[PDB]
Amino acid sequence: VLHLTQDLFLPFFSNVTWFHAIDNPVLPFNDGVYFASTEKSNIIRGWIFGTTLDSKTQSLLIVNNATNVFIKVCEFQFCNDGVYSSANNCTFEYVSQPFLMDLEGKQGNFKNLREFVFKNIDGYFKIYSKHTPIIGRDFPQGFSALEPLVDLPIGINITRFQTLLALNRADYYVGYLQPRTFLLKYNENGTITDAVDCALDPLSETKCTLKSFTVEKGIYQTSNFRVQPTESIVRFPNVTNLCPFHEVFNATRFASVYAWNRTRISNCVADYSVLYNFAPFFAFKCYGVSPTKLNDLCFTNVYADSFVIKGNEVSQIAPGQTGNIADYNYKLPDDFTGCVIAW
Amino acid sequence: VKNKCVNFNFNGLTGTGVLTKSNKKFLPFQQFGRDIVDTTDAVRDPQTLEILDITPCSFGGVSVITPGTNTSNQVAVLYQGVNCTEVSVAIHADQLTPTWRVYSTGSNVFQTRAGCLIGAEYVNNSYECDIPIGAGICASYQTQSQSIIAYTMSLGAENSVAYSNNSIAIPTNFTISVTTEI
Amino acid sequence: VKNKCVNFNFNGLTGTGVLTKSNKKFLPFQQFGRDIVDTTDAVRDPQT
Amino acid sequence: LPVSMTKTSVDCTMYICGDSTECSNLLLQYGSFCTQLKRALTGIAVEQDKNTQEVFAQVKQIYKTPPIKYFGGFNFSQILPDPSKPSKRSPIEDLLFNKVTLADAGFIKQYGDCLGDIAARDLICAQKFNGLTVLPPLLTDEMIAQYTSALLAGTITSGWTFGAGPALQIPFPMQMAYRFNGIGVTQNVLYENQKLIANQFNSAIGKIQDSLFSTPSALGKLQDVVNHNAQALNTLVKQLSSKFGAISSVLNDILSRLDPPEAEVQIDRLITGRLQSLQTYVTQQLIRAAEIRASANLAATKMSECVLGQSKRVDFCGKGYHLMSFPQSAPHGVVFLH
Amino acid sequence: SKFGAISSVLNDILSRLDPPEAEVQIDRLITGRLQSLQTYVTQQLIRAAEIRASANLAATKMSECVLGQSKRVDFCGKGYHLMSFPQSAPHGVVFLHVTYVPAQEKNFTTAPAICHDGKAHFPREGVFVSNGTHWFVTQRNFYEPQIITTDNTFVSGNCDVVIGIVNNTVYDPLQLE
Amino acid sequence: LPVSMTKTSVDCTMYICGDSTECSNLLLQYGSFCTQLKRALTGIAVEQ
Ligand SMILES: *[C@@H]1O[C@H](CO)[C@@H](O[C@@H]2O[C@H](CO)[C@@H](O)[C@H](O)[C@@H]2O)[C@H](O)[C@H]1NC(C)=O
Ligand SMILES: *[C@@H]1O[C@H](CO)[C@@H](O[C@@H]2O[C@H](CO)[C@@H](O)[C@H](O)[C@@H]2O)[C@H](O)[C@H]1NC(C)=O
Ligand SMILES: *[C@@H]1O[C@H](CO)[C@@H](O[C@@H]2O[C@H](CO)[C@@H](O)[C@H](O)[C@@H]2O)[C@H](O)[C@H]1NC(C)=O
Ligand SMILES: *[C@@H]1O[C@H](CO)[C@@H](O[C@@H]2O[C@H](CO)[C@@H](O)[C@H](O)[C@@H]2O)[C@H](O)[C@H]1NC(C)=O
Ligand SMILES: *[C@@H]1O[C@H](CO)[C@@H](O[C@@H]2O[C@H](CO)[C@@H](O)[C@H](O)[C@@H]2O)[C@H](O)[C@H]1NC(C)=O
Ligand SMILES: *[C@@H]1O[C@H](CO)[C@@H](O)[C@H](O)[C@H]1NC(C)=O
Ligand SMILES: *[C@@H]1O[C@H](CO)[C@@H](O)[C@H](O)[C@H]1NC(C)=O
Ligand SMILES: *[C@@H]1O[C@H](CO)[C@@H](O)[C@H](O)[C@H]1NC(C)=O
Ligand SMILES: *[C@@H]1O[C@H](CO)[C@@H](O)[C@H](O)[C@H]1NC(C)=O
Ligand SMILES: *[C@@H]1O[C@H](CO)[C@@H](O)[C@H](O)[C@H]1NC(C)=O
Ligand SMILES: *[C@@H]1O[C@H](CO)[C@@H](O)[C@H](O)[C@H]1NC(C)=O
Ligand SMILES: *[C@@H]1O[C@H](CO)[C@@H](O)[C@H](O)[C@H]1NC(C)=O
Ligand SMILES: *[C@@H]1O[C@H](CO)[C@@H](O)[C@H](O)[C@H]1NC(C)=O
Ligand SMILES: *[C@@H]1O[C@H](CO)[C@@H](O)[C@H](O)[C@H]1NC(C)=O
Ligand SMILES: *[C@@H]1O[C@H](CO)[C@@H](O)[C@H](O)[C@H]1NC(C)=O
Structure with missing residues (x-):
């Protein structure tokens, strides 16, 4: 079968950064990262994940050892090097068979290469791997598949990525995956003997469109090409028609609460910046809309009731309240769609 | 920003494409402009009171001409129905939706009546068609050492009859040919 | 029961078909399986 | 007889979802209900190519007419290509080209002047707005005239031999005598009334041009094919102005006005309507292509x-005892002179 | 294809939703599947009609x-047609047209008629061909020169209307005997 | 050999929405979908 699937996949002939080790920069994590490492026996233990890497957001630590692994989604404080400290909120400790499989044919020339891929779509951390003593120069050229090992629902926030080392007395092949459509050739035994990207080459686009490896001589209509608009303009009518907000907030004789002036605001453009610059507010609570989300909304009619009142009465004025003002002077309906402003 | 594909949101109408100066006679009350199929064509500027047309940002279709993969891996790209100086600046500014970028050596530019061919070169000879491109152009795989060439149709071998007032050609011999019809 | 068309409800997956021994190569992480055109074909026994 | 029509290569993805990521995602649920349409349309285009090639590419070697034109008094300048015309076309084919006005030529590269249309954009720019494009034909309308010229040269200097084997020259007088012999009249009769028959032929060739000129529409079949294709295309474009039972007809309006999970119903309605319209258009194109292919096969046999x-078959090559015919190229068609 | 519903397998849908809310999704599935089937049947009908046209042409052939x-030219193979043998094929037929195609040809000379004695002579079948010195008659698609006798030609005319007539003597086997 | 078939002149509104103003109005929301059908039926009659 020649199944075609669209899923986050490291691009073919993509660009991979290669590091050395003799201090461990924090590489950004976005849309997964492909990882590879070749070694004689071992120089690497684990990785740490998350944002800000401190005791404030949940983090990850997947250090391996000689017999098992120490996967944990915890809020480690710091190590700067006994890999975590200041336990406050750890959870979900995962222990299984060790990831690192090392085999040697009575010699160190069979340096094992290990390819690891990690992703965090809708949580559900996925770890793929395949261990084999490949030719050992560097990243090979022959195709190799990746078998998922663990699939565990972390359900947290990951932004930055870091790797751990070993003790002692040429690795770090890092590439970033991208959302692409792929087609994979399946062996009759089920293993993937080949795969072709569908965003790399015109020949790849043709082979992908017919989901076949052998393309016969001829023309093939594959897709459509589009010149993406470089910029985006928004233009609206020159109308300004500033609302009388200025005269409702620049008044000098704001009526009392017992006789609350009610101003009917009609036929104007309600810009709220003239409201923001006119009063250093102390209570700008809203109920039916958002103070920020108001400059992009249309309304049929607007009422501005203005009255000067005491301090605690400001907190008194709200839908579903009580008091000498909320009962006898001014009662806000429980179904109020608007805002109050107190300065 | 005129003479450039740009998302526009004129007074509530949203679309994509190129806007520039126009010579319409928008009556003062008129605000929108369309056509037979009523597709929004011209928009009056609400803050300038000038007339601008709206144009398909870029409408073509990519076709790939290739020989058998078992023969070669070289491919050539067809950009149907577009003056490919437009894509040439589009490739340069990298706003093209296609991500695969095939090389432009200057010799691989082809202003065909049926679009633009890229990744192939003119050969002013005339060979029988192998892959139909369109507009009387055919591509084929040939030795220089191997590449993809584009050339015009050769309708056949050039022959001239010898008609005269008293000239007859009479066959002195014959042949039997067995063809096939399926 | 093998070699007998019967209503199965394997792991909540409902259907009606004949179960039999197969020589496929399911990975330990593989659970359902399928065929060319997207129909559940070879479901490995969760117990045996 | 028509031989082919314009080749349309619509792209469903954008024709239904104008540059909308969410709309494309919603369409992705409808399975391979696009690859089928694109395959059908490309099959129609290839079919049109094979129809025109089957009609015209009947002779391998492109013969040229001798420099001197005296075929026993027969006057052939009206059907012979005129070197003065830069397109190398006969005067009759000139009228055939002039009397047919194509709404969409296709070989225009009209991108670049839709912005410069000044006036209201034309059907072509409108179609280029909403996911419609036309693929220009493989055989350029110029080389078709060259094939026609080669066929005409073969049948007036070599008789009917060049379609059987090598082109063997024969003067028009005894070719005339032989076409007479194949009907039931002795060659001597021609050799006695050659001047009269040549004058008859010249008068008829003079009158056919005036008959084609003065008629309102005698090329009504080719005009009918062009008008049918244009009308179907215009209706197909106009179909995007139907709300189909939703709030509005504009995808970017519905998307920007309503939330995703409520606008989902309306966009589904728009998908179901627009895609059904495209399906109907594709089916009508299929029927028209089948009829045009039948007509092209008839034209090739003719x-x-x-x-x-x-x-020898009566009435097949014009009314009466048939003698010959001359082919003449036309826009999306052929014109025979029995 | 899910066709805009919860899942693309009804067996799963019914084992996951009760009737009075599942009927909507199953109706969506029905409409999508039947629209696809309508497309398939229409395309099959078109293909069958085209195959029927081809089959009628093949039956006539x-x-x-x-x-x-x-006698039709370019119907039973290119060139003059002689015979044809059919061969069975998978879902079709294959022909073996045997066609007569001429070969090496030579300019000789031609004349519309021969005027022996004030009378124009015309060939009963064939043209009048000249080696260059001696006029001859022959067939049309093969060069078989023959002596111009009274049998090969029919006489009708007055030797003053045929343009390009050429002077030569005709023969007859009756004056000799 | 058949030469012609019975000519048909089906009508959109009368077939679909028998004398129902609301039904005809909601049919108008479907655009000129059925004018194509009327034209095609006129065409088939003409070719007969
Ligand atoms: C799929 O797996 C089968 C089981 O091992 C393989 O069959 C074997 O093949 C080897 C030779 O490679 C034989 O020696 C052995 O007896 C058995 O038949 C089969 O080859 C394999 N197919 C692949 C990998 O394509
Ligand atoms: C007509 O053409 C035939 C082939 O097309 C000739 O037959 C050939 O004869 C030569 C020897 O003369 C053979 O070597 C060859 O294999 C072939 O059979 C035939 O002679 C020719 N006839 C005339 C009269 O020219
Ligand atoms: C063959 O028929 C032609 C008709 O197109 C003749 O051309 C004519 O040329 C005269 C001027 O000499 C024009 O006045 C006329 O309108 C027409 O174009 C052509 O002479 C004629 N040739 C012979 C040999 O009969
Ligand atoms: C005219 O046709 C003649 C056929 O009868 C050819 O004459 C031949 O000439 C030879 C000797 O030259 C005779 O022996 C033989 O019987 C035959 O008559 C003659 O070549 C031909 N002339 C030309 C110019 O082709
Ligand atoms: C064929 O031979 C005829 C005599 O048998 C020729 O007729 C002659 O014509 C000339 C004028 O050309 C007269 O002056 C003479 O009295 C005789 O009638 C005839 O011309 C000739 N034709 C050719 C083509 O050679
Ligand atoms: C990888 O990096 C090198 C150097 O920074 C750059 O030249 C190359 O283009 C990159 N790879 C790709 C595929 O762009
Ligand atoms: C959990 O972590 C927060 C910091 O993210 C810390 O303030 C809190 O005290 C921790 N939980 C405990 C120890 O109760
Ligand atoms: C490795 O981790 C496992 C986790 O269960 C632990 O039991 C073991 O003691 C650790 N160390 C070694 C050397 O096995
Ligand atoms: C009143 O308007 C003036 C003029 O803009 C401004 O300086 C002043 O701050 C305003 N005062 C109030 C209370 O709005
Ligand atoms: C409300 O404001 C207007 C502003 O002109 C003023 O005339 C009116 O007297 C005010 N009413 C009260 C109750 O203060
Ligand atoms: C739009 O308003 C600005 C602000 O005063 C003004 O300068 C400009 O002339 C106006 N233009 C139009 C077309 O009204
Ligand atoms: C398209 O062709 C060339 C190349 O771009 C240029 O003259 C112009 O852009 C266009 N010309 C016409 C006549 O459309
Ligand atoms: C050779 O090709 C060039 C274009 O590359 C063309 O301009 C020139 O006319 C051609 N020469 C001949 C003799 O056809
Ligand atoms: C044929 O004869 C006519 C007059 O008899 C002459 O004008 C013409 O040039 C001749 N052509 C040839 C090819 O001999
Ligand atoms: C007849 O003569 C012409 C004169 O050049 C020549 O070109 C042609 O090949 C000849 N036909 C033959 C030999 O069959």
């Missing part, structure tokens, strides 16, 4: 019989 | 090029 020899 | 000889 060419190989009447032009490339004498046809 | 059989009954013409096999059960007789065709």
Whole structure:
């Protein structure tokens, strides 16, 4: 079968950064990262994940050892090097068979290469791997598949990525995956003997469109090409028609609460910046809309009731309240769609 | 920003494409402009009171001409129905939706009546068609050492009859040919 | 029961078909399986 | 007889979802209900290519007419290509080209002047707005005239021999005598009334041009094919102005006005309507292509019989005892002169 | 294809939703599947009609090029048609047209008629061909020169209307005997 | 050999929405979908 699937996949002939080790920069994590490492026996233990890497957001630590692994989604404080400290909120400790499989044919020339891929779509951390003593120069050229090992629902926030080392007395092949459509050739035994990207080459686009490896001589209509608009303009009518907000907030004789002036605001453009610059507010609570989300909304009619009142009465004025003002002077309906402003 | 594909949101109408100066006679009350199929064509500027047309940002279709993969891996790209100086600046500014970028050596530019061919070169000879491109152009795989060439149709071998007032050609011999019809 | 068309409800997956021994190569992480055109074909026994 | 029509290569993805990521995602649920349409349309285009090639590419070697034109008094300048015309076309084919006005030529590269349309954009720019494009034909309308000229040269200097084997020259007088012999009249009769018959032929060739000029529409079949294609295309474009039972007709309006999970119903309605319209258009294109292919096969048989020899079958090559025919190229068609 | 519903397998849908809310999704599935089937049947009908046209053409080609000889040019193969043998094929037929194609040709000379004694002579079949010195008659698609006798020609005329007439003597086997 | 078939002149509104103003109005929301059908039926009659 020649199944075609669209899923986050490291691009073919993509660009991979290669590091050395003799201090461990924090590489950004976005849309997964492909990882590879070749070694004689071992120089690497684990990785740490998350944002800000401190005791404030949940983090990850997947250090391996000689017999098992120490996967944990915890809020480690710091190590700067006994890999975590200041336990406050750890959870979900995962222990299984060790990831690192090392085999040697009575010699160190069979340096094992290990390819690891990690992703965090809708949580559900996925770890793929395949261990084999490949030719050992560097990243090979022959195709190799990746078998998922663990699939565990972390359900947290990951932004930055870091790797751990070993003790002692040429690795770090890092590439970033991208959302692409792929087609994979399946062996009759089920293993993937080949795969072709569908965003790399015109020949790849043709082979992908017919989901076949052998393309016969001829023309093939594959897709459509589009010149993406470089910029985006928004233009609206020159109308300004500033609302009388200025005269409702620049008044000098704001009526009392017992006789609350009610101003009917009609036929104007309600810009709220003239409201923001006119009063250093102390209570700008809203109920039916958002103070920020108001400059992009249309309304049929607007009422501005203005009255000067005491301090605690400001907190008194709200839908579903009580008091000498909320009962006898001014009662806000429980179904109020608007805002109050107190300065 | 005129003479450039740009998302526009004129007074509530949203679309994509190129806007520039126009010579319409928008009556003062008129605000929108369309056509037979009523597709929004011209928009009056609400803050300038000038007339601008709206144009398909870029409408073509990519076709790939290739020989058998078992023969070669070289491919050539067809950009149907577009003056490919437009894509040439589009490739340069990298706003093209296609991500695969095939090389432009200057010799691989082809202003065909049926679009633009890229990744192939003119050969002013005339060979029988192998892959139909369109507009009387055919591509084929040939030795220089191997590449993809584009050339015009050769309708056949050039022959001239010898008609005269008293000239007859009479066959002195014959042949039997067995063809096939399926 | 093998070699007998019967209503199965394997792991909540409902259907009606004949179960039999197969020589496929399911990975330990593989659970359902399928065929060319997207129909559940070879479901490995969760117990045996 | 029509031979082919314009080749349309619509792209469903954008025709239904104008540059909308969410709309494309919603369409992705409808399975391979696009690859089928694109395959059908490309099959129609390839079919049109094979129809025109089957109609015209009947002779391998492109013969040229001798520099001197005296075929026993027969006057052929009206059907022979005129070197003065830069397109190398006969005067009759000139009228055939002038009397047919194509709404969409296709070989225009009209991108670049839709912005510069000044006036209201034309059907072509409108179609280029909403996911419609036309693929220009493989055989350029110029080389078709060259094939026609080669066929005409073969049938007036070599008789009907060049369609059987090597082109063997024969003067028009005894070719005339032989076409007479194939009907039931002795060659001597021609050799006695050659001047009269040549004058008859010249008068008829003079009158056919005036008959084609003065008629309102005698090329009504080719005009009908062009008008049918244009009308179907215009209706197909106009179909995007129907709300189909939703709030509005504009995808970018519905998307920007309503939330995703409520606008989902309306966009589904738009998908179901627009895609059904595209399906109907594709089916009508299929029927028209089948009919045009049948007409093209009839035209190819007509060419190989009447032009490339004498046809004994009555009324097939014009009314009366058939003698010959001359082919003439036309926009999306052919014109025979029995 | 899910066709805009919860899942693309009804067996799963019914084992996951009760009737009075599942009927909507199953109706969506029905409409999508039946629309696809309508597309398939329409395309099959078109293909069958085209195949029927091809089959009628092939039947005529059989009954013409096999059960007789065709005078139609370029119908039973390129060139003059001689015979045709049919061969069975998977879902089709294959012909073996045997066609007569001429070969090496030579300019000699031609004249519309020969005027022996005030009378124009015309060939009963064939043209009048000249080596260059001696006029001859022959067939049309093969060069078989023959002596101009009274049998090969029919006489009708007055030797003053035929343009390009050429002077030569005709023969007859009756004056000799 | 058949030469012609019975000519048909089906009508959109009368077939679909028998004398129902609301039904005809909601049919108008479907655009000129059915004018194509009327034209095609006129065409088939003409070719007969
Ligand atoms: C799929 O797996 C089968 C089981 O091992 C393989 O069959 C074997 O093949 C080897 C030779 O490679 C034989 O020696 C052995 O007896 C058995 O038949 C089969 O080859 C394999 N197919 C692949 C990998 O394509
Ligand atoms: C007509 O053409 C035939 C082939 O097309 C000739 O037959 C050939 O004869 C030569 C020897 O003369 C053979 O070597 C060859 O294999 C072939 O059979 C035939 O002679 C020719 N006839 C005339 C009269 O020219
Ligand atoms: C063959 O028929 C042609 C008709 O197109 C003749 O051309 C004519 O040329 C005269 C001027 O000499 C024009 O006045 C006329 O309108 C027409 O174009 C052509 O002479 C004629 N040739 C012979 C040999 O009969
Ligand atoms: C005219 O046709 C003649 C056929 O009868 C050719 O004459 C031949 O000439 C030879 C000797 O030259 C005779 O022996 C033989 O019987 C035959 O008559 C003659 O070559 C031909 N002339 C030309 C110019 O082709
Ligand atoms: C064929 O031979 C005829 C005599 O048998 C020729 O007729 C002659 O014509 C000339 C004028 O050309 C007269 O002056 C003479 O009295 C005789 O009638 C005839 O011309 C000739 N034709 C050719 C083509 O050679
Ligand atoms: C990888 O990096 C090198 C150097 O920074 C750059 O030249 C190359 O283009 C990159 N790879 C790709 C595929 O762009
Ligand atoms: C959990 O972590 C927060 C910091 O993210 C810390 O303030 C809190 O005290 C921790 N939980 C405990 C120890 O109760
Ligand atoms: C490795 O981790 C496992 C986790 O269960 C632990 O039991 C073991 O003691 C650790 N160390 C070694 C050397 O096995
Ligand atoms: C009143 O308007 C003036 C003029 O803009 C401004 O300086 C002043 O701050 C305003 N005062 C109030 C209370 O709005
Ligand atoms: C409300 O404001 C207007 C502003 O002109 C003023 O005339 C009116 O007297 C005010 N009413 C009260 C109750 O203060
Ligand atoms: C739009 O308003 C600005 C602000 O005063 C003004 O300068 C400009 O002339 C106006 N233009 C139009 C077309 O009204
Ligand atoms: C398209 O062709 C060339 C190349 O771009 C240029 O003249 C112009 O852009 C266009 N010309 C016409 C006549 O459309
Ligand atoms: C050779 O090709 C060039 C274009 O590359 C063309 O301009 C020139 O006319 C051609 N020469 C001949 C003799 O055809
Ligand atoms: C044929 O004869 C006519 C007059 O008899 C002459 O004008 C013409 O040039 C001749 N052509 C040839 C090819 O001999
Ligand atoms: C007849 O003569 C012409 C004169 O050049 C020549 O070109 C042609 O090949 C000849 N036909 C033959 C030999 O069959």
